[PDB]
Design a protein around this nucleic acid. Structure first.
Ligand SMILES: [Mg+2]
Length: 684
DNA sequence: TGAGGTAGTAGGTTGTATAGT
RNA sequence: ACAACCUACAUACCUC
């Protein structure tokens, strides 16, 4: 291997191999009357394990248990969606289970997790929410405290051992009333909770009215209302607080500051305690992970936790190219772009002012200068508020070669931001917004806006230098909406990624992308590749955001086989990688950690040293390229994103683009894009 | 709307198996 | 519940 080896710890710990009594659980038969449904079988079975108590988990059509029947509720009744059933338990003996059997250890692990939860529940000082355990005050001030602990997990190996996973976690508690909060000179909190339950509101403002006068819609006093429900006992109804249901922060609602509790944010506490942060440097996290594991191991009698370690590899650093070698995409602004054509940009200024700020103009002129390309700056002399007549000014501008517009504006409300983007999109004019209290020293902001204005005009700002197996990299993502999704793709064409493009996403019902929409989108990207290279890709790299639904690529993969195109399919999850810590030395991004076959972690970005990185977990779902070669290419593709300028995304450019793309479309809609080139990244 | 990221609180989702015959 | 993920706070906070 030409890559440097390193050892790492995962945040997992190996514990004892299971004993006899743990492998052979009390089995049981479940007789539900009225007999269950079909979509309601498992859900009711599980609600029976919780209703039976003890270390019980469902197994097939019944349940397994690490508890004696003599402490199990064998006769009872639970009410599901409409129907009221009655259960009865029949001890079907005590059969042994098999750690190798995938779906059997699913039960063993299930029980392990249940064991862990009950042992924790009986501990005195600790607070336990699900699998998170908080055990120690970590910080505190007047009225608030932060508890420290860790979310945990206990599962069973294929090889019959217990596995403990630990990751440090914090909980912020505020226990003072809003009245007291404000009386001690603190600022208004954006959100606020009921003192008598969990209902939490957004806090609009304080009221000048009197509680005992504030007439409650249909009845009595603001105060008398609350008094009625006995909420003033051992409390003081304070002043009037106007709040709003966060789902529709319009209609204001009367409340008492004596009965609201602030919900605090890390910054409301960094104001008090100061220098208090909830993210950890990786070495502090590693230390605390080890401490916590040892703490629990000692309350658990499953052996001494032995931190599991893996072999990691430092991947080669990507050589990023502008017109000349660059180290981040913003440097292309100084050196020149990878490939700049003739381009024309327009300005729409929506403060009271007029004309291109000279420093932006010069920055642009310099950038095109270094690149040896022509630039023609235009200025829209029309206002969005001129209604339909505005459109004639936009059409005029596109009919003069304008490829994108810079919008100089005061901060716009989200509604108006979308309204405007859309409005310019109708005329095939992608837009970059730049907020207008703006000063030349605010450099990272306007230089990023510039990088975006250029991607939106179709310029390729950077490309890779290197040899990769795949000449086409395409990433697939689903949806930028709640009750339905989108599903689209973005594209790194050429082995250098010399071109980036997107494809119009297609509305769908859930996560799963219709088998044929997958192949459709893929075909779009192959035709893109063909008219750039005059030929078909010899090999493609296929990437999905998140899990890959069962054979949703099956149809697309056979079509590729038909056409004689080679391929790999990788699933890229943002969660589920846990943590990775060097045993010795620094940790730099570019970290590759093989796990099982067809799977590995990739530490793609490390940069904000006050926080701990979260590795991507990747699964090799189809194809037979060496894991390490996939890792190498994914990693480098990380560096290809044009619109970030000063920091690389954690995701490979195509998956990061696909994400951004389905989010934009879910926000703006699918209309107004017929006249927007697919090389113009309108959505960055 | 500058954009990369790690951390929280409060309130959400889809994908999975699940019979009958 | 397991698994993968969304939104609000948040143009927040940290970072360049
Ligand atoms: Mg943007």
């Amino acid at each position: 291997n030409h890559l440097g080896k390193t050892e790492v710890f995962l945040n997992r710990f190996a514990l004892r191999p299971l004993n006899p009594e743990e492998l052979r659980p009390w089995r049981l038969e479940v007789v539900l009357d009225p007999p269950p449904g079909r979509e309601e079988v498992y859900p009711l079975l599980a609600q029976v394990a919780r209703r039976a108590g003890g270390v019980t988990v469902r197994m097939g059509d019944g349940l397994a248990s690490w508890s004696p029947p003599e402490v199990l509720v064998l006769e009872g009744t639970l009410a599901r969606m409409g129907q009221t059933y009655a259960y009865r338990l029949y001890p079907k003996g005590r059969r042994p289970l098999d750690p190798k059997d995938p779906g059997e250890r699913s039960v063993l692990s299930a029980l392990a997790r249940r064991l862990l939860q009950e042992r924790l529940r009986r501990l005195e000082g600790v607070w336990v929410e699900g699998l998170a355990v908080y055990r120690r005050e970590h910080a505190r001030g007047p009225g608030w405290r932060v508890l420290g602990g860790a979310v945990l997990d206990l599962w069973v190996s294929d090889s019959g051992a217990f596995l403990l996973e630990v990751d440090p976690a914090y909980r912020i508690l505020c226990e003072m009333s809003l009245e007291a909060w404000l009386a001690q000179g603190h600022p208004l909190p954006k959100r606020v909770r009921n003192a008598y339950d969990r209902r939490t509101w957004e806090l609009l403002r304080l009221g000048e009215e009197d509680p005992k006068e504030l007439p409650l819609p249909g009845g009595l006093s603001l105060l008398d209302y609350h008094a009625s429900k006995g909420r003033l006992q051992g409390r003081e109804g304070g002043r009037v607080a106007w709040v709003a249901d966060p789902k529709d922060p319009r209609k204001p609602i009367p409340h008492l500051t004596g009965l609201l509790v602030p919900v605090l944010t890390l910054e409301d506490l960094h104001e008090e305690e100061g220098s208090l942060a909830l993210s950890l440097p990786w070495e502090e996290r590693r230390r605390r992970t080890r401490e916590i594991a040892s703490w629990i191991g000692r309350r658990l009698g499953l052996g001494t936790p032995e931190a599991v370690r893996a072999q990691a590899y430092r991947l080669s650093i990507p050589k990023l190219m502008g017109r000349r070698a660059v180290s981040k995409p913003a440097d292309a602004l100084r050196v020149g772009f990878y490939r700049a054509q003739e381009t024309a940009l327009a300005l729409l200024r929506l403060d009271g002012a007029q004309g291109w700020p000279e420093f932006l103009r010069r920055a642009l002129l310099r950038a095109f200068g270094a690149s040896g390309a022509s630039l023609r700056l235009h200025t829209l002399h029309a206002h969005p508020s001129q209604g339909l007549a505005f459109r004639e000014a936009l059409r005029k501008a596109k009919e003069e070669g304008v490829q994108a517009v810079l919008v100089l504006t005061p901060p716009m409300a989200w509604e108006d931001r979308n309204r405007l983007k859309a409005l310019l999109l109708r005329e095939g004019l992608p837009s970059q917004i730049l907020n207008v209290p703006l000063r030349e020293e605010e450099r990272h902001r306007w230089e990023n806006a510039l990088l975006g204005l250029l991607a939106k005009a179709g310029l390729q700002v950077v490309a890779l230098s290197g040899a990769y197996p795949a000449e086409l990299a395409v990433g697939f993502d689903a949806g930028g909406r709640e009750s339905f999704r989108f599903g689209g793709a973005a594209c790194a064409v050429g082995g250098d990624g010399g071109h980036l493009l997107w494809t119009l996403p297609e509305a769908q019902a859930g996560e799963r992308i219709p088998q044929e929409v997958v192949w459709d989108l893929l075909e779009e990207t192959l035709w893109a590749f063909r008219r750039k290279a005059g030929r078909l890709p010899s090999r493609v790299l296929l990437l999905r955001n998140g899990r890959v639904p069962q054979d949703e690529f099956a149809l697309a993969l056979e079509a590729l086989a038909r056409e004689g195109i080679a391929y790999d399919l990788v699933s890229v999850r943002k969660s589920g990688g846990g943590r990775v810590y060097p045993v010795q030395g620094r940790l730099a991004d570019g970290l590759y950690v093989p796990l099982e076959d067809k799977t590995f972690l990739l530490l793609t970005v490390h940069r904000d040293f006050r926080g701990t990185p979260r590795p991507l977990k990747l699964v090799h779902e189809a194809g037979d390229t060496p894991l390490e070669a996939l890792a190498h290419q994914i990693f480098h593709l990380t560096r290809l994103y044009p619109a970030s300028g000063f920091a690389f995304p954690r995701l490979p450019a195509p998956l990061h683009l696909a994400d951004r793309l389905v989010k934009e479309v879910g926000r703006l809609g699918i209309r107004h894009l017929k006249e927007v080139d697919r090389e113009k990244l309108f959505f960055v």
